[PDB]
Structures are given as C-alpha cells and as structure tokens.
Amino acid sequence: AGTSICTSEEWQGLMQFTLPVRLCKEIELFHFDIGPFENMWPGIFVYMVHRSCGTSCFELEKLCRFIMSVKKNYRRVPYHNWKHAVTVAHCMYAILQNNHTLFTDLERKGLLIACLCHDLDHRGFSNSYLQKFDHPLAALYSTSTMEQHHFSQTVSILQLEGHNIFSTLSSSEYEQVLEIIRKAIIATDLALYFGNRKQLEEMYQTGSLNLNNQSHRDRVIGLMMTACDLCSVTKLWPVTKLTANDIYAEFWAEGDEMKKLGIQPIPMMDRDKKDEVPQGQLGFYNAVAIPCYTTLTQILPPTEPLLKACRDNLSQWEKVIRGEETATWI
Numbered sequence: 001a002g003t004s005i006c007t008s009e010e011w012q013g014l015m016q017f018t019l020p021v022r023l024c025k026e027i028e029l030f031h032f033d034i035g036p037f038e039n040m041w042p043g044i045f046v047y048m049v050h051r052s053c054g055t056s057c058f059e060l061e062k063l064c065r066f067i068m069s070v071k072k073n074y075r076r077v078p079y080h081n082w083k084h085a086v087t088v089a090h091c092m093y094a095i096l097q098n099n100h101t102l103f104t105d106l107e108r109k110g111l112l113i114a115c116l117c118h119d120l121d122h123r124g125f126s127n128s129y130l131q132k133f134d135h136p137l138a139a140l141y142s143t144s145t146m147e148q149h150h151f152s153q154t155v156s157i158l159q160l161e162g163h164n165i166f167s168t169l170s171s172s173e174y175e176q177v178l179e180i181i182r183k184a185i186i187a188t189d190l191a192l193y194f195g196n197r198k199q200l201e202e203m204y205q206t207g208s209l210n211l212n213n214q215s216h217r218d219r220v221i222g223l224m225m226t227a228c229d230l231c232s233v234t235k236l237w238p239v240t241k242l243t244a245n246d247i248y249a250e251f252w253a254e255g256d257e258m259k260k261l262g263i264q265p266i267p268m269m270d271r272d273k274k275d276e277v278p279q280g281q282l283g284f285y286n287a288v289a290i291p292c293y294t295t296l297t298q299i300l301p302p303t304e305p306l307l308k309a310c311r312d313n314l315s316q317w318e319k320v321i322r323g324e325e326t327a328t329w330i
C-alpha cells in the first residue's frame, strides 16, 4: 500500500556513474544481455536516455530520482521485476537506435520511460487470476487490469516531489507524452497484441500502412512494445533458457494459489506438469513470438536480428522436444 521513494544516497550515486568503455559498443546490439551487470542497470538506462534523447533531455537530478524510485516500486518477484524492466528498455533502445528518425524526440523519451515503467508494482499474478477471483484491481480496471495499474503507478511516481522529468515540456507536449506512455503501457497487454498484429499485417500487405497517420503510428508503437516485452526470446539460447526458469517460477506460484481455491490451473501454471513446458514453449513461439517479430521485421527492416534470434530459439525448443538437449544450470 503506497508509492516508494528512493533515498538521497541512491539517486546521488547514480549521477556519478559512467559506463565502462567496453559496454558502450555492446549495448548497441539487439542480443546484448544486461544480466551480468546488475550494479550498472540504472546507469545503463541513463546512458540509453542520453544517447537516444540527449544529455539535456531531462534534468539529471530528476531523472536519477525518477529511475531509483521506479526501481524501488518493482517487487522482488521472480520475473516481472526490475531486471525485466531494464531488459525491455534496452530492447526499445536498440529498436529506436536502428530506426531513429522514424520517431520524434517526444516519442523516444516517452517510449524509453514507458518500457522502464511498464510492469511497475507487478505482484506476480496474471490478469486471468485477478479477474477470475475478483481482486479489487479487476473492479477498478475491467480490461487490461495490470497494465492500467502500471500506468497509474507511473503517474504516481512522476507526481512525487522532484520526480517529474516531464515538467519542462510545454503543456501540449506534456499531454502528448503522457498519452504516448499510456498507450504504450496498455499495448503490453498480450490480449490486445493478437488483433494489433493482424491489423498491421493487412495494412502492410495492402500498402495502406502510413506512419503520418496517428492511429497507424500508435499500432506500430504497440507492436514495438510487444517485441520489447518478449525479447527474452531473442537472446542467445542459454540466456533465453535461464529466463524461462524465472517466468515459470511465477506461473507455478500462481498455479499453487488456484489449486487452493478448488480450481485446476492451466498446465502452464502447474508445477506438477513441467514435462509439458517444451510443447508449451513451441506453442508460444508459433502463435505469439514468431508472428510478432515477423511483422515487426516487415515494418521496420532493421529489426530483423530479433526475428533471426527468435527463430534460432524456436529451433532449440524443437531440439529439447526431440531429446537432443545439452547441459544447463540454475
């Protein structure tokens, strides 16, 4: 109950940070894994904001406060946590860097911030759970339940003393960026993804796709959000496989709760059905990940390495199913 705020020592320490030279080159690539550099994650985000949006886009004090309060409002859950937030923001950075002048200054800043904030205060439960069992959140937010909460948490953090990184925007640009953010966060509801990707595919194939059309732009941004949210499937195989362990740790914990209330969980959230995971992963890649990156690659051809990597990981799950799997740790 309530918005957390970073300490003086936390945000002051971030202002001092400089990115090691070797990482400067690596951070540009789509497959970059932030995993091994935990101490550097806030500093990595500052760096990305500064390279994409400029060293004076935000007042440094307010941005450093904002980042450390966002960090503090992610929960210590196995997957929908601070590491996930920075991972999704890094994917967005790589997409924007490769497609830079397609997007406005306002869009780039709003989207980097939306990615960092997009799962704020996640409790490790799905929309399915909150709705099936009438959590107060599902009463307040009838659809896209958690995503509407993540947006509310973002606005709550911006409204903290010294935390409004957007306050120096004109009143018009301030409304615009908040709407960019709101739309981008709501688009991370995978329910909405299926229709969005279908709409985009048809627009692309008929030639009606037009990025000067605001509604088109919104949908393209929405698909970029999905692509970033799912980007664990675009990393090198060992990273992808380890990330899957974290994702399933959350699912299984939710499944246990459904059992307690007399409901058999979906097999995916059932820790007694781990044998079905490889087939489950295949389904997810075929129905969700491959289509997402295929459509994104059509619209933004520089994002092709995401699709290549996703295809590579699908081939690895197929190997698991055939029993060709080699050694892994946890």
Ligand SMILES: Cc1cc(N)ccc1O
Pocket (backbone or CB within 6 Å): 230, 232, 233, 244, 247, 281, 284
């Ligand atoms: C359900 C799911 C699976 C994977 N591998 C990544 C993200 C997801 O939401």
Ligand code: NI
Pocket (backbone or CB within 6 Å): 118, 119, 146, 188, 189
């Ligand atoms: Ni989410």
Ligand code: NI
Pocket (backbone or CB within 6 Å): 084, 088, 118, 119, 188, 229
């Ligand atoms: Ni997410």
